[model samples]
Target: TTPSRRRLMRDFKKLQEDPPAGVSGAPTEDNILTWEAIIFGPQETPFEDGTFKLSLEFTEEYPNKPPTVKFISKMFHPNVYADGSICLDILQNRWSPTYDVAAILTSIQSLLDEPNPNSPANSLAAQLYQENRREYEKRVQQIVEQSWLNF
Candidate 1:
């Protein structure tokens, strides 16, 4: 059964008009399923103010099938792959059709504050995080401040 495309577009329209904190995305007009996302670094973490790009591709059955979102840049986080795949449940196992864009962004924001080391996107970062969070944070800040120009 094909869901109402109009409903999805309406939702995207509202979100575009007023994007969530630290999150901005624009779905392609031709194919509303494809979107480009920009997430500002969370203030509590080292990436604060830094903008990270992401690609979000939703299905026509979206809400039923969650969007496939991936980071398009280098991000130093235990839950984010060096290649930039995010390890957020909302985008995967925890997904529910009732969840909206705002909820998804909020969940991601919370993830930065509290990462789940038990499951890691990048094993090295996860190990470092498990060993010493302070050092890991310093290292991230160093990368962002000293290297990543966007930061």
Candidate 2:
């Protein structure tokens, strides 16, 4: 097996042993390189009680190259694109081999509550996040409710 596959097994073991709060992930039955994940919205946030799905695709370069992570569930966030792509520093310019699946999911969980509007993937969300707090939260709440209907 390649180093990437070995590293992925270790990451999977760690995730199973001590799953992070509000997040869970597992490799697809037929492919270790592909994974599905779930993240429950944090308490006290507009996204509270929401369950979001995501997909992660790892390359042979794995730890050396960050996995492609995207939301499978619809989301309304400044850093989330309409197609569910996320704009996060750690997934790109700041990616590090030290980050595991658990780390990635937890980071995303926190991001749901604390968004960075400066670099946005969704222009409308970014605009609302910066200009109108009430509307931004309203939109978020709408998605949060819609999340329950997804599954």
Candidate 3:
């Protein structure tokens, strides 16, 4: 279904007022309910100097609920799924009404710099992060290289 023009206006206003960090989104080429993004990996981290693409699907009740965010590039982080879905609590159970698009994007950037091992998107990546930090860094390095090459 097409988004009500009112909602589009509201979201557009919000985005204009405060866009997210490392990520800029706009309606999908074909649908207003869908959005696209490009994430810049935070500086000084394994993901630094890399660019990553992602998307979002907002419900009619967006702003009241968090939108889905999934990475488009293959990544080796523990907070990302095999299919590139991110497993961040803020996008789910930890969502707060006060958070805005810019805040969410900033949070994702922060997550890039810091991940929660207890709730990982990839178990093997999580284990490697825990038992072999150096190897984990290498994996992230590989992904960063791939991101810059592909994204």
Best by TM-score: 2
lDDT of 2 at 53: 89
Report the number of the highest-lDDT candidate.
2
Off by over 4 Å in 2: none
lDDT of 2 by residue, 1-151 (tens): 9999899999999999999888899999998999999999999888899989899999999999999889888899999988888788899989999999999999999998899766888889888887998999999889988888765
Predicted structure 1: clash tally: 0
- lDDT digits (tens) for residues 80-122 of candidate 3: 8988888889888999756755666677778887887767879
Q: Model 1, 1-151: lDDT tens per residue?
A: 2473655676677777887788777777787777776677777766675666777777777778888777775667788877667889878887888887666766776676578766888777787788987878776776565334542
Q: Looking at model 3, report the run of 10 residues with the lowest lDDT sum.
A: 1-10
What lDDT does candidate 2 reach at residue 71? 88
Native-to-model Cα distance after best TM-score fit, residue 118 in candidate 1, in Å: 2.9
Ranking by lDDT: 2, 3, 1
TM-score of decoy 1: 0.82
Judging by TM-score, tell me the better candidate of 1 and 2. Answer: 2
Q: After superposition, how far is residue 119 of candidate 1 from its true place, in Å?
A: 1.0
Scored by CA lDDT, what does every candidate get?
Answer: 0.72, 0.90, 0.77
